[PDB]
Amino acid sequence: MNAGGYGNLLMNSEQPQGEYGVTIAFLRLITTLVKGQLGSTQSQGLVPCVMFVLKEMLPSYHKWRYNSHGVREQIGCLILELIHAILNLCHETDLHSSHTPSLQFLCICSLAYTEAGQTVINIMGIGVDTIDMVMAAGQGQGQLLIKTVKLAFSVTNNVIRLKPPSNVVSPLEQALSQHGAGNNLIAVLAKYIYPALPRLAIQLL
């Protein structure tokens, strides 16, 4: 028909309350779907489309207001997770070119082109400022924070290696140098050890 992701329009209007729940449910379903592609079914049509929503979500993320930062933690982590998975899983699935590469390709081009670091930076900043608290970190929140941060670092990491074969290079690398560390990333390892933080941060560097 003619172009139209219903979920995007419906969700984008506002992001408090149930609307957040709706988006989260979608993201969870979408993520399971990519995993499902591992098993495989009619992957190719659904799959790229999933990224389209995911990518819209990730950059729209900056502006959106969330119920809470923890909520924000969950959404960013999962959305980013889907995009991370798409790049990685793509090779394994068998038909021909791949069901997923179209999906994955959109991912690479997206960051490769109009590049908004802010979603990535946001995670970097949040992780920097978690509360040094034993409880209510409880470690459920803490685990989410590490998870968003870890997943984000790995994801940025994936982009960078993937970038030179194509030899995109340029801005993402520069942006990473800017954040890098070059101040905030370096700080990250101090915060936790790696109780969450250091290996991922160092690995990225």
Next chain:
Amino acid sequence: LLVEIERFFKLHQEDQACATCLILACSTCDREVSAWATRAFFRYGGEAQMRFTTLP
């Protein structure tokens, strides 16, 4: 009678109504409504009323 042509039908008869209906359809300077209606009567008669037919 164009809107009810039963009255014409009653007095004049069906055949004559058909003939006049044909003339109106063909008739020149007539409104489209008139021509179409007359054509409709000629072709289909009155729906669920007067039927237009060969009978054994």
Next chain:
Amino acid sequence: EFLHELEEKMEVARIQLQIQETLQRQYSHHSSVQDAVSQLDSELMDITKLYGEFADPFKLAECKLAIIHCAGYSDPILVQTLWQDIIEKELSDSVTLSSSDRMHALSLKIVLLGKIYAGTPRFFPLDFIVQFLEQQVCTLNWDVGFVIQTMNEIGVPLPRLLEVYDQ
């Protein structure tokens, strides 16, 4: 805004003219109940009044449909339910020989109403309607293109029809 009032008026007035015209054809009516015509010509009427009083009692499904267009009543169930009645009524009059004859009349009835509503999607759900029509006509002799041709004639574009149909 004057224009706003004027156009709405023209629309409602037109409906009465249609209802009035049908009243003549209808044989359920009595000449002495001329009062209805007097009422029709006499003034503009409330839409609900037109709908409840005239359309339902005289089963003018087409009119009812058009009226709800102007009202802009979206409710799909009610809109669809009305459509079901129109289709069902059509079946009653038919005899079979006029598969073609009915074919034409059916297309004729649909196209006319279709032209008026087709601009808006609520009364004329193209997606919902097409199958409905096919299903109806299916219990009849068939030539391909009979269903779609009516929509094209209705005023629907080839491009619009194509995407929905493909879907």
